[PDB]
Amino acid sequence: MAQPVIEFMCEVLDIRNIDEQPKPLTDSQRVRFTKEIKGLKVEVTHCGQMKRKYRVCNVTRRPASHQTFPLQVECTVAQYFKQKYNLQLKYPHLPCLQVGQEQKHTYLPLEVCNIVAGQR
């Protein structure tokens, strides 16, 4: 089974009350989380059965609420999932994952991500 990256995060940062502390992440926490998620493979969950897979290459410093990107004029990733997918993010305060080629600057909210377990 695939594990939600939110849960993976809470495990990495030793959190149990993620829904009690709507607090953003400390620089210390982000760095600790980034080390663990960087390089893992993830699958999108907001597109039904179109579970597109991505390679996490980094973690943003800005929350999904503020992370911006070149939308075809700049937009907020949180807006995106509210406008295009009509889904208010549960954690707009947590960072987004950067997936794919660096220069492509693709950001995904942690909420919509599941860690893909290897199948050797």
Structural domains of the chain ordered from first start: 1-120 (2.170.260.10)
Q: How far is CA 100 from CA 40, 53, 69, 85, in A?
A: 11, 9, 15, 21
CB 26 within 8 A of CB 92: no
Resolved by: X-ray
Reduced to 3 states, what is the DSSP secondary structure of residue 29?
Answer: helix
Residue 85: DSSP 8-state: S
Residue 3: DSSP 8-state: E
Resolution number, Å = 2.6
Reduced to 3 states, what is the DSSP secondary structure of residue 11?
Answer: helix
Residues in the chain, total: 120
Helices (H), ranges, 38-115: 77-83
Query: Whole-angstrom Cα distance, residue 47 to residue 68?
Result: 21
Cα diameter, the chain: 43
Strands ordered across the beta sheet of 41-44? 3-4, 113-115, 41-44, 53-63, 95-99, 106-109
